[PDB]
């Protein structure tokens, strides 16, 4: 129990995710992290709800609106399609609408964004969407991974400064190396609170 | 667009990990694994550490099988993975853990 | 109850053989496999011996993938078995051939 | 084409099918044979229809009524249930009924029985059934494999003698040896008319 929240996880299924610099692929390393996060969020509180959305491929696609049915959630993660480039602002708009319509309005709202690809948007553009989320009581967690987009951490951290309220929103930067992506995230507030 | 695997009202959930030790941090499933055992196992019930029964002639990228409810016949080296798909006995989810490569 | 696996209107048919060579007598699939090639393949289209494209990081016991109609992107070592499940592009059946271990 | 027929394949999913004397299992040796037969019959004539029925488990179960949809047919053979003992009389009756109501009456009618288990019936009762099959123009193919009652070959042969009509019915005795079940069958009239 304790924290009661509805989360929308936005996963990166862009063409950049075929890369094996995260072994065996960025896609597989994300999948394991997302799977672990769904189990941790559902087992934290039986009234938590988790939904899943893809950001690229052939368009932003909701795989499930937020639910407490862990089997239904995990079933979405088999047979992912891969291609294109992420649509970060659209995916955020869609996830927030899903969160707004949650049946149990007692739940806090949280979007987790897996940013595995370059971010094409502008820093000012990202600040406004951050301010909008904050006004609507929506927290954000950002997982920055992938490989040469130098302004990417700056843009993502500007998003974070704009959305953050009472330490509810976080960013994690994790390059590839000896630890799998999921293992780095297990220590961070993405998993701990 | 959604992939779906089913036997009646039981959903089949395929999950793939590069390393089975990753499952140590996968709740709720971790509590059913005995990480000292060799060869893939299925559970006859949902007691703690219940995944202990040896699956017959498993693919060797199979890591294990967890039925999330109800009970079924508990025996080593008799039921292949295919026959276990018919043995939900009211379980709503059959989780099949696979090793990536 | 019956086992069902599917992606939209596409039926997924899992077939298992102890020996790849048994497939050489399996009509009509013996005409679509290219048994001179090493490692499991899928077809980009319908033609004789069209199963030529290398599946990425395949399970050790995967023998090949046959889509029974339509066309799809044809590249070696790019699409995993899981992603191929989204690439029927109108095929009514995806045949997945497995080796018994 | 020219031979146009509707076939019901009766498969043995009794407890006896777990035996490894046919490598790797009687069930898997039977399954490969059935898959090859379904492919051969459906490709022999696009108007052929094949159905599949299990004789044992928790009672006789029709997996599919005769169809020419090879994908629908082959999909029945993944995830078979195993148990009990066969109900050969009930199975043959249900096969006969499915064949009697085939859509295209120009089709010939054939039943193939995989007898991988002991035969818990008396010769006189099998001769009655085969007599009924013969009267209703249904041909029979019998696959005799596995062990342990001494008289099963004679009982199966008596059934064949009563149904056989102008050499249209056949029996194959295949023991656990070097050539797998399917290999033995390929060169017999089960596959070659």
Residue numbers in the entry:
A (entry chain D), D (entry chain B): 0 to 146, 148 to 193
B (entry chain C), C (entry chain A): 33 to 133
Could you give the paper's own sentences about this structure?
SAP05 is an effector from a plant pathogenic phytoplasma that mediates the degradation of host transcription factors, including SPL and GATA family proteins, by hijacking the 26 S plant ubiquitin receptor RPN10 independently of substrate ubiquitination. Specifically, SAP05 folds into a tight globular structure consisting of a parallel five-stranded β-sheet (β1-β5). Although SAP05 carries a single domain, it utilizes two opposing surfaces (hereafter referred to as Lobe1 and Lobe2) to interact simultaneously with TFs and AtRPN10, forming a dumbbell-shaped structure, in which TFs and AtRPN10 have no direct surface contacts. In summary, SAP05 bridges the TFs mainly through electrostatic interactions with a hydrophobic core, whereas the SAP05-AtRPN10 interface comprises predominantly extensive hydrophobic contacts.
In the SAP05-AtRPN10 crystal structure, one asymmetric unit contains two SAP05-AtRPN10 binary complexes with almost identical architecture. Interestingly, the N-terminal loop (L1) of SAP05 becomes a β-strand by packing against its counterpart, forming an antiparallel β-sheet in the crystallographic packing. Appropriately, the α1 and α2 helices of vWA domain, which are not directly involved in the interactions with other subunits of the 19 S regulatory particle, pack against SAP05. In contrast to the acidic Lobe1, the Lobe2 possesses a strong hydrophobic path for AtRPN10 binding, where a cluster of hydrophobic residues including Leu35, Leu73 and Leu69 on the α1-2 helices of AtRPN10 plus Phe49, Phe58, Ile47, Phe61 and Tyr127 on the Lobe2 lining the central interface. While at the edge of α1 helix of vWA domain, the side chains of Gln27 and Glu31 are accommodated by hydrogen bonds with the backbones of Thr48 and Ser50 of SAP05, respectively. Of note, a number of water molecules permeated the Lobe2 and vWA interface, with multiple molecules mediating contacts between SAP05 and AtRPN10. As a result, this binary complex buries a total of 833Å2 of solvent accessible surface area. The results showed that the mutant E31A, L69T or L73D of AtRPN10 was unable to pull down SAP05, suggesting the prominent role of Glu31-mediated hydrogen bonding, and Leu69-, Leu73-mediated hydrophobic interactions in the recognition of SAP05. In light of our SAP05-AtRPN10 structure, we found that residues 38GA39, located on the α1 helix of AtRPN10, do not directly participate in the interaction with SAP05, albeit they are in close proximity to the SAP05 surface. However, the substituted His and Ser residues, especially the bulky His, would induce steric hindrance with the SAP05 surface.
